[PDB]
C-alpha cells in the first residue's frame, strides 16, 4: 500500500550494516598497542565477503 511501501522501504534503504575486512578488525584497535612490540598480534580466521 502507498503508506506501507513507504515504511518497509526506508527500512531497506537504511540497513545499518557496513561490510567487514580483516583490516577493519585490525583497525578497531588503538593506533598504539599495535606499535608496542611487547604485544603480539596475528590473524587466523578468514573472512567471507
Amino acid at each position: 500500500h502507498p503508506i506501507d511501501y513507504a515504511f518497509n522501504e526506508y527500512f531497506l534503504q537504511h540497513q545499518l550494516v557496513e561490510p567487514l575486512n580483516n583490516d577493519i578488525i585490525f583497525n578497531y584497535i588503538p593506533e598504539r598497542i599495535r606499535n608496542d612490540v611487547n604485544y603480539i598480534l596475528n590473524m587466523d580466521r578468514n573472512l567471507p565477503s
Binding site: 531497506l12 567487514l20 611487547n38 603480539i40 598480534l41 596475528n42
Partner: protein
C-alpha cells in the same frame, strides 16, 4: 482500492551473517614480563 498503484517491486539484499562482540578473532600472545619496554625502547623495569 486500485491494484497497480499498490503493487511495488522489492530491492532486498541476500544472505548476510551478522557478527557481534568482534575482537575474538584476535589471536594474541605476550612476551615474557621480564622483557618490557616503554615508548622509551631501552626497557621498562631494567634493574636486574
Amino acid at each position: 482500492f486500485d491494484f497497480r498503484n499498490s503493487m511495488h517491486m522489492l530491492t532486498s539484499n541476500l544472505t548476510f551473517t551478522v557478527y557481534s562482540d568482534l575482537l575474538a578473532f584476535v589471536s594474541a600472545d605476550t612476551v615474557e614480563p621480564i622483557n618490557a619496554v616503554a615508548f622509551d625502547n631501552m626497557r621498562i623495569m631494567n634493574e636486574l
